Design an enzyme around this catalytic site. Structure first.
Site, short mmCIF file in Angstrom:
data_model
loop_
_atom_site.label_atom_id
_atom_site.label_comp_id
_atom_site.label_asym_id
_atom_site.label_seq_id
_atom_site.Cartn_x
_atom_site.Cartn_y
_atom_site.Cartn_z
N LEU D 36 25.89 39.58 34.55
CA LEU D 36 27.23 39.05 34.65
C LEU D 36 27.24 37.58 34.25
CD1 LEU D 36 28.00 40.65 38.10
CD2 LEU D 36 28.86 41.47 35.92
N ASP D 37 28.44 37.01 34.16
CA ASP D 37 28.60 35.60 33.82
C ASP D 37 29.37 34.89 34.93
OD1 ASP D 37 31.48 36.33 32.12
OD2 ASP D 37 29.78 37.71 32.00
N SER D 38 29.51 33.57 34.81
CA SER D 38 30.09 32.77 35.88
C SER D 38 31.44 33.30 36.33
CB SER D 38 30.27 31.32 35.44
OG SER D 38 29.04 30.83 34.98
N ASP D 40 32.71 36.36 36.01
CA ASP D 40 32.49 37.59 36.76
C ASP D 40 32.08 37.28 38.20
OD1 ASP D 40 32.95 39.72 34.81
OD2 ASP D 40 31.21 38.89 33.77
#
Ligand SMILES: CCCCCCCCCCCCCCCCCC(=O)OC[C@H](COP(=O)([O-])OCC(O)COP(=O)([O-])OC[C@@H](COC(=O)CCCCCCCCCCCCCCCCC)OC(=O)CCCCCCCCCCCCCCCCC)OC(=O)CCCCCCCCCCCCCCCCC
Ligand SMILES: CCCCCCCCCCCCCCCCCC(=O)OC[C@H](COP(=O)([O-])OCC[N+](C)(C)C)OC(=O)CCCCCCCCCCCCCCCCC
Ligand SMILES: CCCCCCCCCCCCCCCCCC(=O)OC[C@H](COP(=O)([O-])OCC[N+](C)(C)C)OC(=O)CCCCCCCCCCCCCCCCC
Ligand SMILES: CCCCCCCCCCCCCCCCCC(=O)OC[C@H](COP(=O)(O)OCCN)OC(=O)CCCCCCCCCCCCCCCCC
Ligand SMILES: CCCCCCCCCCCCCCCCCC(=O)OC[C@H](COP(=O)(O)OCCN)OC(=O)CCCCCCCCCCCCCCCCC
Ligand SMILES: CCCCCCCCCCCCO[C@@H]1O[C@H](CO)[C@@H](O[C@H]2O[C@H](CO)[C@@H](O)[C@H](O)[C@H]2O)[C@H](O)[C@H]1O
Ligand SMILES: CCCCCCCCCCCCO[C@@H]1O[C@H](CO)[C@@H](O[C@H]2O[C@H](CO)[C@@H](O)[C@H](O)[C@H]2O)[C@H](O)[C@H]1O
Ligand code: SF4
Ligand code: SF4
Ligand code: SF4
Lengths: 176, 114, 115, 76, 155, 114, 207, 94
Positions: D36-38, D40
């Site tokens: 995931l990313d920030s 998310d």
């Protein structure tokens, strides 16, 4: 110098105080206002019977545009493009080339009458009185396209309206 | 002289004791001006004009004749201006505009035409 | 029977005019046409939101005063009594107490709308 | 309810569509492991705020990178 | 003969509609000042049955009297959609017609006919009050020529 | 390279304001769809919000980030207060724009635009 | 007094010059330049840090009393590294005088809001933000004021095109007004008007 | 102008003014719509001598601003204090 619009002390004597009580109770100042509208009921109205009667205008009136001719029938416009340059609305579009007899004449002269602000600068700028604003103001259309005038339309306007235009120019050219 | 019924300006109340009020305000301004450096142009100029106004107040017991000398409108307008000057003096203590120019502008910042 | 007939005719006539109004014209219904009107822009919030009443105290006082007229309306008939000494005194007593009640609400700032 | 809070937090992380429940573990890392990313992560944290009815300030939310790290945070 | 009956009924509904045009109290810029002068005593639009009404629900004509900007365009379309039918649009002045003096601006709709259908274009900047009246009477004659019931009869 | 900040002293403080804005937009999409009676789902609305943040992910100047956040809050306030109309909210989805293929051959067939 | 030439007024020129250096003496921390035009208008050019100290002084000082903010605006000069010039035009009723205060900023540098000095400055700063994109710090309510909702860009910058980037129309399919890339039936016709011959030698720049 | 005597009296009384002296409808007191031609005068520069343009060139007299201070004693005000206005003698109080 200045003056005060609302700086007055009412008199406090018995007569004045009773005058104000009568105004309050008997609505005298409201009755006076009724008199004014009554006087107007019996005045002749200012309405004119359009279209059988018309509002007054002067020779300077700026209306529908027209392209003019010399008495010989030759077009006055020699495609200098001064009107196109000065037009505050960029409503004029011009193309030109030598005519078959070598004359300097336009092949396009469009006025977008929905761009035009009817300011009269084009007729001021014209050195030969070719483009004018005539006296017609009753040319509302049913479609937008009918107000995009090309040279044929503008020459027809000049031929249609020249009798009035020339008399109007005669009346006002010594002011120009 | 007879008291003013109104100053003529909406929201500016008439002052019953203008001489005393002005003396208080100018004295305060001079007091606050004493914490500014002696060579700061703001102190020198504001002291000079404040002392002129204060001298005129002491030498003229009539309000209407005082208003004429002050040339600042109604006396209540002069009082308001004295209050505005006092507020500014306190602020200039914290700004210290008498210090040297914080920064020169870039080369052509004020050149017109470009 | 005449009264009932007259009422029925009046409201029948009005109802018929509304039936004609809805079934005679040509309709063209779509979403934007029937949306609520607020000068060309969408409303913010429902029109069913509470709408503060600033004359709430006069409205309640109206209920009490509205009932006083029910006590006073019989006055033309009461004037036909032989006992006019009592009737006039009681008639003036009721009106005066209504005037006192108005004066109280007036002096205590009850007729001024809430700010 | 430390035993249960492991379940509600795992149920929410399961519901969050982007996360494959087969790769999910109480120690799975949102960025390095679960991919995931920030943003998310910020989305997951708002899901936590819902089911637990309390606020996680961004200073707090930035450290919760594993399901367990969320569990430890709800305890207080 | 149905043809005769529908023809006469067309004349009646057309006559009623053109004789009672209620423009929406709606004006945008300087052209709206000349629209005020058409209501003023010299021309007295009300003497033709032409009466302003503020509510779009009670209006038959929208006179777009002035410049239509991009910010205003959705509100103009909204109140036009809220007019019951039949409804008509009169475009008044260069700005409404095609942008006019502001045609090349980033914030102006180049003619109100990009937003609503237009029945009459009144040229001028502004059109004189008489010019606008000429446009209203031109609209009346357009309504007079409508053939709603005659076309329905032949459907 | 000494410049006056807007809000954030460095990118670490700016990314905190970015996350705060993203939360505010993320919570707001459900109300926007409901209030404006949009025919899109909350998922599409939040995907669009995500797409708007993503296009700016490459910035590294804190001042630029601060201005993007300032505009983002202005945009959010316009939406929350229904200053925007439905037409404004839907302009983010460009529903009437025809596809413009982005490969060399497709552009070559249609015109001269690179 | 030649009939077609505007007459000079040296008394006003002298008075404004004296007051110009009066302001420079009192606020040396912020004043970068003082000039008086040939038609007697005084301009104080200041460092942007001095907006509040300078404007407060001109409003409140007993020898200034510039109570009214006639106008607040900006000018864009792309060739400058600080492209935006911020201009305050103030009026003094007491002394029947006007003064112009000018400062500068770039696209990314905030300017302190002058609403504390002049409540009139509120909408003027919103307009400057809207039309130029200059941010004003500590503004109670900074947002667009003239442009359409959601409008992108700052139209009064010199590199914003005259007709913008988008235009509006009504679309029947979506039943609403839509925004699409701008196309013009007739492109605006750029004119090159400047004469290649110098007009005003008095203003010639050194080569 | 065609109002009968009784109607003139009625509206005169109701308004409280003699309305016939200042009618708001125009009749024969207006200027004729055809006028004799004008003969406009010329300006001060219409001369055949002593008229060199350089001596009457306003545009070329404009100069760049006077630099008072740049970063390359009594207090003053921008101008004398404004004189107090006088009350009107035509009508001081309305
Ligand atoms: C219901 C009520 C109506 C039923 C009763 C009808 C009675 C007959 C009406 C006659 C009006 C005809 C006027 C006329 O001769 O035309 C002149 C006109 C030519 O004259 P003109 O050159 O125009 O000059 C006009 C005057 O100079 C300028 O005009 P003027 O203002 O000077 O008026 C002249 C004359 C015209 O008046 C009349 O002739 C009729 C008076 C009836 C009064 C009823 C109320 O009035 C007078 O002379 C003053 C006396 C009239 C009573 C005034 C009292 C005012 C009220 C008091 C103020 C407070 C009010 C509260 O010819 C026409 O235009 C013919 C048009 C016909 C119009 C229809 C008339 C019938 C009206 C309906 C009939 C019933 C159905
Ligand atoms: C319920 C029935 C009501 C009957 C209304 C009768 C309409 C009368 C009328 O049309 O006015 C004359 C009208 C007046 O004509 P007009 O309306 O075209 O006049 C234009 C305005 N002037 C004259 C001032 C230039 O005559 C007609 O035009 C014929 C219309 C026939 C209407 C259908 C009747 C069936
Ligand atoms: C104070 C009281 C005043 C009351 C006044 C009452 C009006 C008196 C004048 C009557 C004139 C005749 C009415 C014509 C107007 C019809 C509306 C119209 O223009 O539609 C165009 C339409 C045109 O339709 P179209 O088929 O051509 O196309 C429309 C559809 N699109 C949009 C797709 C193109 O005309 C009709 O459809 C039918 C015309 C019938 C004419 C006879 C009228 C009969 C009415 C009975 C209807 C049945 C329901 C009962 C209603 C109550 C009965 C009274
Ligand atoms: C033997 C002893 C006898 C004892 C009995 C004696 C009784 C007679 C003496 C008592 C006084 C009698 C008159 C009473 C009339 C009512 C007076 C009244 O209420 O009006 C005053 C009212 C006050 O309002 P205001 O002026 O704003 O200031 C008040 C401050 N609180 O102001 C108003 O109401 C103004 C109303 C505004 C709306 C007016 C719009 C219409 C105006 C034109 C109407 C003309 C009258 C038409 C009457 C037709 C009747 C068929
Ligand atoms: C034993 C069982 C027997 C049962 C008998 C009943 C069966 C019912 C049959 C249903 C028929 C379906 C009719 C659909 C319909 O009526 O809608 C169309 C029409 C509205 O008009 P529309 O077609 O939408 O478009 C033109 C608008 N100007 O019409 C309308 O909808 C308008 C209706 C108005 C309300 C009148 C009721
Ligand atoms: C807050 C509380 C306020 C209380 C206010 C009470 C007000 C009362 C005021 C007095 C009103 C009645 O005043 C009184 O009226 C009656 C008639 O009705 C009169 O009575 C007179 O006429 C009647 C017939 O009409 C005869 O029957 C009677 O013999 C005769 O005396 C009295 O002569 C008079 O004194
Ligand atoms: C028996 C029937 C006939 C008798 C009349 C019965 C009604 C009597 C009503 C008496 C009202 C007296 O008390 C009322 O109180 C308010 C205080 O809020 C007073 O004063 C206030 O109201 C008046 C008018 O609203 C304002 O002009 C005034 O500035 C304000 O201070 C009123 O001037 C006074 O009239
Ligand atoms: S009247 Fe003015 S706007 Fe119209 S074509 Fe002439 S110059 Fe252009
Ligand atoms: S109309 Fe007149 S100004 Fe315009 S191009 Fe022709 S000659 Fe030149
Ligand atoms: S067409 Fe002319 S008068 Fe009408 S709004 Fe536009 S600029 Fe104003």
């Amino acid at each position: 110098t200045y003056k005060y619009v609302n700086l007055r002390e009412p008199s406090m004597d018995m007569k004045s105080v009773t005058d104000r009580a009568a105004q309050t109770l008997l609505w005298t100042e409201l009755i006076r206002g009724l008199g004014m509208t009554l006087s107007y009921l019996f005045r002749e109205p200012a309405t004119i019977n359009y279209p059988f009667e018309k509002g007054p205008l002067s020779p300077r009136f700026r209306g529908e545009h027209a392209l003019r001719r010399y008495p010989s029938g030759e077009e006055r416009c020699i495609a200098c493009k001064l009107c196109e340059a000065v037009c505050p609305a960029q409503a004029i579009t011009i193309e030109a080339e030598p005519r078959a007899d070598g004359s300097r004449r336009t092949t396009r002269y469009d006025i977008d009458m929905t761009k035009c602000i009817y300011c009269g600068f084009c007729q001021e700028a014209c050195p030969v009185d070719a483009i004018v604003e005539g006296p017609n103001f009753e040319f509302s259309t049913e479609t937008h396209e009918e107000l995009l005038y090309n040279k044929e339309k503008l020459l027809n306007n000049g031929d249609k309206w020249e009798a009035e235009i020339a008399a109007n120019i005669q009346a006002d050219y010594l002011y120009r | 002289g007879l008291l003013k019924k109104t100053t003529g300006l909406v929201g500016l109340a008439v002052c019953e004791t203008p001489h005393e009020r002005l003396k208080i305000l100018y004295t305060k301004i001079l007091d606050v001006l004493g914490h500014i450096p002696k060579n700061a142009a703001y102190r020198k100029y504001t002291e000079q004009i404040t002392n002129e106004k204060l001298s005129m107040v002491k030498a003229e017991p009539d309000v209407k004749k005082l208003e004429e000398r002050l040339q600042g409108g109604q006396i209540e307008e002069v009082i308001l201006q004295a209050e505005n000057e006092l507020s500014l003096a306190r602020k200039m203590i914290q700004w210290k505009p008498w210090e040297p120019l914080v920064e020169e502008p870039p080369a052509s910042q004020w050149k017109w035409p470009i | 029977m005449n009264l009932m007939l007259a009422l029925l005719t009046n409201f029948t006539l009005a109802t018929l005019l509304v039936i004609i109004a809805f079934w005679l014209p040509q309709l063209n219904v779509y979403s934007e046409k029937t949306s609520p009107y607020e000068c060309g822009f969408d409303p913010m919030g429902s029109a069913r939101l509470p709408f503060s009443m600033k004359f709430f105290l006069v409205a309640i006082t109206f209920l009490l005063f509205d009932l006083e007229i029910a006590l006073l309306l019989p006055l033309p008939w009461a004037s036909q009594t032989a006992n006019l000494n009592t009737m006039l005194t009681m008639a003036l007593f009721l009106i005066i107490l209504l005037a006192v009640s108005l004066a109280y609400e007036w002096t205590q700032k009850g007729l001024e709308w809430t700010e | 309810t430390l035993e249960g809070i492991k379940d509600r937090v795992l149920y929410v992380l399961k519901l969050y569509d982007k996360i494959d429940p087969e790769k999910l573990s109480v120690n799975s890392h949102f960025m390095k492991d679960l991919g995931l990313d920030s943003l998310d992560q910020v989305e997951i944290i708002m899901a936590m705020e819902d089911e637990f009815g309390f606020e996680i300030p961004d200073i707090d939310a930035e450290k919760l990178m594993c399901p367990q790290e969320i569990v430890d945070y709800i305890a207080d | 003969r149905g043809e005769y009956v529908v023809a006469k009924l067309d004349d009646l509904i057309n006559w009623a509609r053109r004789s009672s045009l209620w423009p929406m109290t709606f004006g945008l810029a300087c052209c709206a000042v000349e629209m005020m002068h058409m209501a003023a005593p010299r021309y007295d639009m009300d003497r033709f049955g032409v009466v302003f009404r503020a509510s779009p629900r009670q209006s038959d004509v929208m006179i777009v009297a002035g410049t239509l900007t991009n910010k205003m365009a959705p509100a103009l379309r909204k109140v036009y959609d809220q007019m019951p039918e039949p409804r008509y649009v009169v475009s008044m002045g260069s700005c409404a017609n095609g942008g006019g003096y502001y045609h090349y601006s980033y914030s102006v709709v180049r003619g109100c006919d990009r937003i609503v259908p237009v029945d009459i274009y009144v040229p001028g900047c502004p059109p004189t009050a008489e010019a606008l009246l000429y446009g209203i009477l031109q609209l009346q004659k357009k309504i007079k020529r409508e053939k709603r019931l005659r076309i329905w009869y032949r459907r | 390279t000494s410049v006056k900040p807007i809000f954030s002293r460095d990118m670490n403080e700016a990314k905190r304001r970015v996350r705060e804005l993203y939360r505010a937009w993320y919570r707001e999409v459900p109300n926007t769809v409901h209030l404006f009676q949009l025919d899109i789902s909350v998922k599409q609305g939040r995907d669009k919000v995500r797409e708007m943040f993503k296009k700016n992910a490459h910035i590294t100047d804190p001042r630029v980030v601060d201005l993007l956040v300032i505009k983002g809050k202005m945009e959010l306030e316009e939406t929350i207060k229904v200053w925007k109309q439905r037409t404004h909210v839907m302009r983010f989805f460009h529903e009437t724009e025809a596809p413009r293929p982005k490969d060399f051959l497709s552009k070559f067939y249609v015109g001269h635009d690179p | 007094t030649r009939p077609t030439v505007r007459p000079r007024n040296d008394v006003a020129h002298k008075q404004l010059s004296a007051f110009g250096e009066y302001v420079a003496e009192i606020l040396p921390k912020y004043v970068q330049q003082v000039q008086v035009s040939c038609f007697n208008e005084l301009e104080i050019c200041i460092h942007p840090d001095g907006v509040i100290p300078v404007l407060t002084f001109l409003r409140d000082h007993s020898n200034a009393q510039f109570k009214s903010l006639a106008d607040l605006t900006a000018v864009d000069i792309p060739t400058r590294q600080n492209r935006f010039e911020i201009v305050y035009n103030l009026l003094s009723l007491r002394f029947n005088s006007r003064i112009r205060v000018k400062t500068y900023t770039d696209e990314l540098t905030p300017i302190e809001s002058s609403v504390p000095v002049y409540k009139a400055a509120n909408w003027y700063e919103r307009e400057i933000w809207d039309m130029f994109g200059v941010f004003f710090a500590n503004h109670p309510d900074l947002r667009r004021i003239l442009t359409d909702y959601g409008f992108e860009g700052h139209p009064f910058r010199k590199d914003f095109p005259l007709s913008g980037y988008v235009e509006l129309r009504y679309d029947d399919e979506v039943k609403r007004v839509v925004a699409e890339p701008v196309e013009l039936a007739q492109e605006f016709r750029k004119f090159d008007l400047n004469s290649p011959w110098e007009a005003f030698p008095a203003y010639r720049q050194p080569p | 102008a065609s109002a009968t005597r009784f109607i003139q009296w009625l509206r005169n009384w109701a308004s409280g003014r003699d309305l016939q002296a200042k009618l708001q409808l125009r009749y024969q007191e207006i200027s004729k719509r055809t006028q004799p031609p004008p003969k406009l005068p010329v300006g001060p520069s219409h001369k055949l001598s002593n008229n060199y343009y350089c001596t009457r060139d306003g545009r070329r007299e404009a100069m760049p601003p006077s630099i008072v201070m740049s970063s390359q004693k009594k207090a003053v005000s921008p101008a004398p204090p404004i004189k107090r206005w006088e009350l009107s003698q035509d009508e001081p109080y309305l």
